Curated annotation (Swiss-Prot):
Database matches in Pfam families: Response_reg (PF00072)
Gene3D superfamilies (alphabetical): 3.40.50.2300
Cofactor note: Binds 1 Mg(2+) ion per subunit.
PROSITE patterns listed in its UniProt record: RESPONSE_REGULATORY
Residues found modified as 4-aspartylphosphate: D57
NCBIfam families per the UniProt record, alphabetical: PRK10610.1
UniProt KW Acetylation keyword: yes
Name the UniProt record assigns to this protein: Chemotaxis protein CheY
Lineage, opening ranks: Bacteria, Pseudomonadati, Pseudomonadota, Gammaproteobacteria, Enterobacterales
UniProt GO BP: aerotaxis; bacterial-type flagellum-dependent swimming motility; chemotaxis; internal peptidyl-lysine acetylation; phosphorelay signal transduction system; regulation of bacterial-type flagellum-dependent cell motility; regulation of chemotaxis; signal transduction
Cell compartments where the protein resides: Cytoplasm
Record PANTHER family: TWO-COMPONENT RESPONSE REGULATOR, TWO-COMPONENT RESPONSE REGULATOR ARR22
Origin species: Escherichia coli (strain K12)
N6-acetyllysine, modified sites: K92, K109
Amino acid sequence: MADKELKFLVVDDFSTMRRIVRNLLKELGFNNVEEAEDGVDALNKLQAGGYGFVISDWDMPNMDGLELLKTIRADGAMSALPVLMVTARAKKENIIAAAQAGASGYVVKPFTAATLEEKLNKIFEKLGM
Ligand SMILES: [Mn+2]
């Protein structure tokens, strides 16, 4: 995956979290990044088209990460979009629910650029990108 212009949507209700993830992506060379504050905001943005990767918080108001993921996977145009879930604490049941709903990966925050890079690269490889 040599497309540094892959367009990311970073979804989290905390502005600081979104900024952290944006800055880590920038460090890795991914600068084509947009932000959303909950699952509905995310879906509104995704409808505009052109997105290549979603990084979403698990716990958000109004529409949480699991519901956002399910909606993406049920969308014809976006059904195969990579979705990496972010959580403050790994839990077996959450990991399995996310997998059942089609998550591409799951990562615990706080994380470093090297940790994000490994998550992204393993997802790109798994998906044949
Ligand atoms: Mn949150």
